[model samples]
Target: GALERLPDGPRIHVPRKTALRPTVARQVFQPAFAPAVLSKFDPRTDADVDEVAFSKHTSNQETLPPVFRMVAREYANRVFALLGRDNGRLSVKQALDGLEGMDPMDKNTSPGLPYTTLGMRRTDVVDWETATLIPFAAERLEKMNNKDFSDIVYQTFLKDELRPIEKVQAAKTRIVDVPPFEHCILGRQLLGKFASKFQTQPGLELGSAIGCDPDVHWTAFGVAMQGFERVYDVDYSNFDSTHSVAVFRLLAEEFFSEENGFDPLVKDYLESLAISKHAYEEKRYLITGGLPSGCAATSMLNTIMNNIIIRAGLYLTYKNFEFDDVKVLSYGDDLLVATNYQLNFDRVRTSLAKTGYKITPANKTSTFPLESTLEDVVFLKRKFKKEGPLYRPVMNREALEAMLSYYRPGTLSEKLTSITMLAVHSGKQEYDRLFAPFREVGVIVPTFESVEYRWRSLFW
Candidate 1:
């Protein structure tokens, strides 16, 4: 049986590092409390290794009112009450206090058994595409139809492209980027993205260079009102980790919001996303909550859930505090909530606590006045340092250096991905500084992946 444990260190990597290349922490986090770029020990305060969280919804109804676009605090809070009432969601502590509570595939599912013997594809198999990434797809997919499935997908299958780079996470980290074979593969068609029509020109560009541009940060950063100064970042422990319960809450709302049994392809597509699967230790396990690291559906679904959580939390924070000014960058697990005042940050944090979102717990995030210094403002893979008006884009050295080590020591894919990512952030001035040796070698025989992109895309 799988078991749970405590976290070892902070996951916020300025140069902090992304876990796409796993097996890092054993080295980086060894100092009792330091930044974790690689190795093990990044488990959530909840669930255990080889386990998931969202298993079921208490209410038969498990859906929200398509709340992604509605950023209204009231709208989100309404669904919060709906979710609380329907699924019986609890603060993270409650799940632990009970310690005894608890997905899918057509195979006999119970979560505890991981996965029962399967007949067809292995449950542990995961898709290597970006529609495969928590990265979202089409708006019409907001339809099942004339649009071909490939249209919704990006131009690349990230898993295979970046294969040279080793990636892993705590057994029970609950990240939902990679989905099971049965669900994710046929999962697309089931979602109705691949309908009667088909398109040859395509790919799921989640991890591609163009897919996740730093402009996204600028897009969100633009929302900051003139006076807001306090900007804070929160590295949520396994934010996407718990999906079973939340998934149920989402679908149930969809099931009922339509006033019961109406849509066809939509119904099947919704169900497909809800189904969970996994292969653990030669046995197929079920992910009641372990989220696939990056997938469009999870991106869309969780974005909705993520939105509701923050919006409702924002509502609660607004209720207690006097200041209502704020701007937020909610890209799945990485979140930035900027407020006009300091207490606002604390209030929002309080809301996160009530919801059971465990903060990574580190002190590396240093903030200075926006106009004065604005020191070290980094997001995702790019770092936007200070300037009076125009900002400078520099290499996220921690993030870059961290991921570079994961792939084969001297392979082309690793360096290619590295140089490509850097090319986007900085230019020849710095590229020559770090990867100059590789440039001199001029080994251009093999091109494993597109030098076009890095970091996973959440918006596709």
Candidate 2:
């Protein structure tokens, strides 16, 4: 009987497609593998046709497409060469070994290594808005005035004009300018700008410095130098998928429809939106990871959930100690709570546990040392340590070699392009050194430009 209280995930409808979308595997991955992945799919029936067909082909060598299979074989050949299984099929563990200790989120756990820094380079307040403003509002609203949370969102977003676009012919497009959610571009930009201003308004009473470090990559450099003596990290487990759909709907109704006069047409369109899943593998089964991956509204929904969780945690922390000195920063599930007193940490931790968020203990730390090693890089003093910021590179020798091996016997231009990207992000001086020999001959250095910009300010 008690099981009734347990929360369940969202329900989705899967429709059988007569043919796979050409755009499905159109991105970075080679499209040659699409037919192989889709080969198991039955266009006529939506059921598990692949299960029966795949049982006979248990080996990945038979199941995987030529490109992927070749890549895997190359990996096993190089990595397990000493193991004497060079020509044999590689296990999933061996394939995934390259990803070990890589920091996708840009958190600094490694010391004296170069880390890729990501930020909102396009806009000023926009960068501040996403990085600090949205997070600050989410934490402040959730913890201090949850009742007003829906109303604030209603006033800010639901009231804004949402325009519908008519079908049009395709135009010339650049690879870089294509947005993931093309239809939602205006909405995202509009919301981004609004969020930037929402937190800064003094009437909101949202604390300034006590907000989540919006861009964790950039924050990693600062935190590495300053250390965590006063700073602590909190991670939310499976943050994007964990919240209840029913709760999200109820809040949406209150904010977007019942209170703010949001057009029912638009609201209904957004509510009925379904995200298609693609190419996710679990054990011997192939499936899809659903829930909107690149939807504009998903961002807002995440912010709402984050607010609810942080608010509950903050309420409990205050209830226990009523401390005023604790400063907080949260973005999605990643949180940083700073305090002078140690007891506040206990209260914060306890509060988080009570709110259904499981903190990854490995990510949480009380001590922050200037010189430490974590994740992808080592903390070192270069530019920032000399009252500025920069660090040496930490190269994953095995990972790079494995990658290079997979692309071996390919074109020189593409190979050099790949090498260039690896070198740019490698952060190791030796990467440049390795290229010196190639340059000494006639290897033309591959050159590319990357741009970073911010949103237009309200005054501008």
Candidate 3:
């Protein structure tokens, strides 16, 4: 019964004004008409929605908005193109054509020819904290640590005098200064310093902010890169922080290039980063694709869910922390991340140890069985009033299966549009019942108008 799991998707959000919106049409498309009839609706000759084609990788913020509006407009036109347009049946293949042609995720190529390149004056990241915020910590992290980050980390965690804000700021600033982070990454200096503080202390052994402050870890989300992206330049369009994927990819290729299966410690760490990074990449695509569709929040959650589990697991796994804590708080694409965290590294290793993963002393605290201390992240379920807070959709493996199924070796657009369909299904009330005891933890309302449009197009 449990084997019949569903797909993971985004939180649906149809604007109230769009309550009665109709499915859009492609006026330029013609049925099997003769050459003369075809002359009337040739896509080459027609002035329909297809005329405004947008490549998935357009980074221009201003020009891009109108393009999104056009896409939404096209969907709106399909249902009422002729004001009293004829209603007709379309083959599944015909209906799915757009799905085949689109690829919101843009995963087919790495730094793909058109979109991927060290572009002009790389986009800027906005950092909240600055050296002006905490000069002392900032100086210490950047110049003091220089190369021996391990010492910097040990010092920060042990430093008792640093205020919460000070520590946070310092760590953030440190992350920004990491040498690997050059002009390609941009942000304020303070954020990097703050991240450095976290990196110095790790806090994994201390357990205060164990899995938080990703930038400092330098394993997956390098702190320096995050600072550059968030704090420095304001023009960068990070509304959908997909740029993070590129940074991580860079780090992975940089750090994990060594031969595997020999250095267990190094190998394990890289493996965790790789897994988390892959999941993060998928989320980036979902979010970017859904940005114009009004489901960005859901896609945002999808991103978090994809990365959080792995990062959290890594936190526990690295330090040999363990817990039998497994909980499924929610399961909808728009709000699937409401699930619980019952993951026990020990249990995970026990379950899959023979397969590949092994449990060893992850950090300094080698005395206790670190794997047993793994506590499933307890999502403050009630906080998720609606689909907005469903941070991670993959909590339910069933949801992941469903999500992945839509993308299974299909034509580009098929997978892209299939994601929209998945978003609609994720909003269904039925999912709420099945993932129970996992006590749903996110908002229930839809977050994107485009989600409903996809549903109407495919099912209505």
Candidate 4:
């Protein structure tokens, strides 16, 4: 009833006809392909695997952080409690009912779809709901085996709807433009506020939430949906999956549903979806390149999943500790836990591992007053680099190329503009060496009048 009262959208009921009719249907959890060993990657010699070649490798001799197994086992127990007897099965109505109340964020739902007042443009963001399509997907699921169902869902409906339409004009098309800096600022503010009020457990350092790319296969998302239900069973004392469910439900039904989010063509395509990658040529498959890199909906859903996983980690790591002991502030995959609890770190590391979220050990920070460095900030149009106390601007390479391609053409124009832009954004003295290339080319140099005009126009 409380969920039905939430202001965002209408009550979303289970579809009359669902593809997945049996609650007991089983599926195999296939792990993602191994990342390419960076040392072995050669573009010319290894063109076939070059795309996946530059992967990070953990040492074979690497040991788990202390107390990992203990925390992990405890987390597993809690998760098992949530799983219940029937292998973590739930009715479609029960699952849908769980998602009653949550914030839709008006237009503020996703970072990519920033609050319109901020002047950020919206793009091809879609909300997907299998329920809206009646018996199409549900019937297919009933007939197919587990692997077949997983493959078809990923390769067909999901990917087909995701493919780019060539019909849209280039000027009008904006499939996955990166989020604006304002989006980052909004996330930071919300996280900062949560950090301020959230209490930290003793002996635990709730340091800034470490950012990690899970680098898993898209099929993992389906696995994650199942995992979500399994873990959601445990009693976290204070935190519940309601918040997560509400947001997910709102997005899936109100936003992704064919009636609201997708058009008729996209809707039909999704009902029987199929996707193909150019690299594979004739072969088409279910997996996508992880998640859509710049889709706001994917971004938010990813963050929500990360939050759920980390909270489980904290719960397991500090099961003996008080409820307030573990507090985490996360934006997408980047996260900050109150660092006061050092013991909890290893527990977090282990718990995330078990839950299929792999964190880069090198990215972990031990100190506070956390620095938001170049790599730390993601999904933005511009990169901000810290030079001394102030952050200086660096142009996004893709955005820069696009801008240059639009303003003018040719080597001379590009070089001059690129160098000048860099000089302005980076300190002039830092890029003085670039002037040598211009001098060697014997390009006709601009006089004071032209230089002054260019600077004024460029800066303005």
Candidate 5:
């Protein structure tokens, strides 16, 4: 009785995350929802008859770096442990998922082969990238042909929402399109939409404890949700199913509001809940239970954002064919920067610029302070951010300079106005020694530190 009188302990309190996830129920995922996105994917499917396509065609090829073999062994062992049974070989999903617990020494560790210890040059950079499949230039360009890649990744503005409305009317009921960037907005809506299905994850309590501003808009919440959906789809649906639960909620809400009759095709059995006598009870709960009681709630928003980020990571792995060790560098919560080869830099830069973005310079360094040439500086933006050694080295610029303004925080118009130089200034001995082995190793290359390093120059 005494124990019962005290307040109960906290529940696992799964936040009211987005709904209609495939989970274990939809054993066989179908990617029909977004045909544009499905055509470009390469996940294993029962429909795949061309086994030869996946066979190692270059048997007489050079052996991989010695590190790769060790990594593969480590990966297999971890896969075995996570599955709790020996499958002899791990599925991509199993290998990728098992990565979270793997030892750093393992070869299969993230940042494995093609990319290793990336972006450690300056102490100011941060590494939030901890997965095995970090995309380098070679990997991204390899899968450029996947058809759905565009639809899933292409930008969408307010008008993109209108096309789906027309489709829903024709189909009667369906998911409306919402960008991954808006998962938080959509997630709260889902909680209200499916109020009868499950209770809201204790987001309100968590938000209060962490000091989430009820009134301010949090973009990360939406970004994370979008990534989560992308990653989950890669694992379960083989990147085929692009229509996430977030999309469904937006579409359904709009469809019903217009008095469009139910489309048997979209809802099927679920349609019954719409007009059933229980609708009132379900609607009340859906409309009320969230961090914010209004139309959209923060819990819903944040969960979806988390989902989207994980998905982007997974997608990077799938397109690259395997998870190699990687290093990700980020700024604040929005800009996710990576590097690839120079070719990728050009492609991405051209595409992004054409889409109406003004690139800026972000990083600057004097790789060879003693060299006789023009001042070396680097400018980077989203388009060329993902291009690494393949396209350039030592990223130091603003790819989106037009969007930056130092006076405004987190605005696209901001720039890196000052920096503390960290090269051979005082560490001359160490810098000189690091390259001392170059000549002995039979390489006649100049000291990398001596170069006038800019984002573009490093790659060139």
Candidate 6:
């Protein structure tokens, strides 16, 4: 009933696992999301693969921050205790027909890896990129499969929606053409963009949220429903098929929307219900589902969904609630909201409740001074600290200790690369401590630059 009451949209297939997503990672984290936003994405630059040049990879969420797995385990165990031999190993969809826009698929598609896209890389400041791919960059996600091909078409169809957001980053405009919102201030937004690498390092989202409105725009009609047809020689006849155009179309409608900014997809789907035909009944479930796992666009789309829903939840409460400070920091569904007044904080939760989402009980912090133990300023995938009006990213102290204990380096190369992923989030204390043993032993340890910080830098 807890997650049930939090109906984000239409009923969705809450699968136990998928070929790519081996766990129910999304269900625990997905908050209430509204359709539509502004965006900009570079059209894909796909490169064909060589026979020997191919490799496969899978998304293992367990390798992420320890906290994520902790939550997933807790939730999973809860569900496990509730289950019995009477209902074991059954597909979550065994009881129902799936997505309406496309026919129900008999089975899931095979697991696959993504193609690395190819493009000339540059930044606003100067030309500091490499002759080719970065030294540690993952394999190029060029046009590897049907998903990649559809991604190219989907990106082309909606790239324009995300354009103006880049203009905000370039400092090109005045206020958003909406009713003036006076008191509410969007404090700090750490932005992340889909294919942000195509333009800027992490694009503007990696820059800061409020700093960039983000060239994010998606609507039912914003993208070509026939965009899938553009992918030469590919035919995803069924939306229920893995990474189907219909799935992308429906999910795209889930995130960004048109300049009319009102939803054409939502209206069309809702209109279909006017018929209430047997088909219409099936159609409603297809359109009203939450974002599922394994889609190519999951990571980027989740960030976009998080960005808009949070902005909406926080923004709607802006007028009715009075606060000296009001802000929401969103990074892939992990959010941190801060305000001077408790009522304003309560108002955010209250407003979000109307949308059938929850501010996880433990996720909310209400210390008057905003000062707490080591991990108080948690946001994004790791830790941060609030210094006056600024936030500095840091690694979770306990998670770091856990990582260090498990990380045993034997060889010289192992010594250096051991901290590959967690290096950026480690604070100076952790860094020095990490190298303390190695330094006396004559190992030439490396250092990491401080991650960037942000504040109320721009407008909506």
**Best candidate per lDDT, number?**
1
Q: Which candidate model has the greater TM-score, 2 or 4?
A: 2
Please give, for residues 1-460, the per-residue lDDT of candidate 6 as tens digits. Answer: 0011112332212111112211121232221221112222212212211111111101111112222223223322322233211211112132112222112222233211111122222221112222132322212112211122111110000111111223323322111111000000000000111122211223222311321212121111112111221110101111121111222233223322232122233223212211111111112112122333323223444444343444455455775542213333334545444433343335656765554444432332332222322234343334444334333345454444333332222443463455533544455566666555556557665654422121122112
Instruction: Give the TM-score of each candidate.
Output: 0.49, 0.36, 0.18, 0.32, 0.17, 0.34
Candidates in descending TM-score order: 1, 2, 6, 4, 3, 5
What are the Cα lDDT values of the candidates?
Answer: 0.35, 0.30, 0.23, 0.29, 0.22, 0.28
State model 6's lDDT: 0.28
- Tens-digit lDDT string for candidate 5 (13-73): 1112121222111122222221111111223222221112111111211212232233333
Of candidates 6 and 1, the better by lDDT: 1
Off by over 4 Å in 2: 1-229, 237-241, 246-291, 297-304, 321-326, 331-333, 343-355, 361-427, 430-460
lDDT of 4 by residue, 153-266 (tens): 111111101111121111111112223222222222222222221211111122122222111111121222221111111111110111222223232333233433132222
Expressed as tens digits, the lDDT of each residue in 212-281 for candidate 1 is 3453434334334223565555455442334434444344344223333223344444543344343332
Once model 2 is optimally superposed onto the true structure by TM-score, how far is the C-alpha of residue 320 displaced, in angstroms?
A: 3.8
Alpha-carbon runs more than 4 Å astray in model 6: 1-288, 315-328, 336-343, 361-376, 381-392, 405-429, 435-460
The list of candidate 5 runs beyond 4 A from truth reads: 1-333, 339-346, 349-460
Model 1 bad stretches (over 4 Å): 1-182, 185-212, 215-228, 239-241, 251-277, 282-287, 318-324, 341-343, 360-376, 386-393, 408-418, 421-429, 437-460
Alpha-carbon RMSD of each model: 14.4, 22.0, 27.2, 19.8, 26.8, 23.4
- Please give the range of 10 consecutive residues that has the lowest summed lDDT in model 3: 153-162
TM-score of 5: 0.17
> Where is the poorest 10-residue window by lDDT in model 1?
200-209
Whichever of 2 and 6 has more TM-score, that candidate is 2
Whose TM-score is greatest here? 1
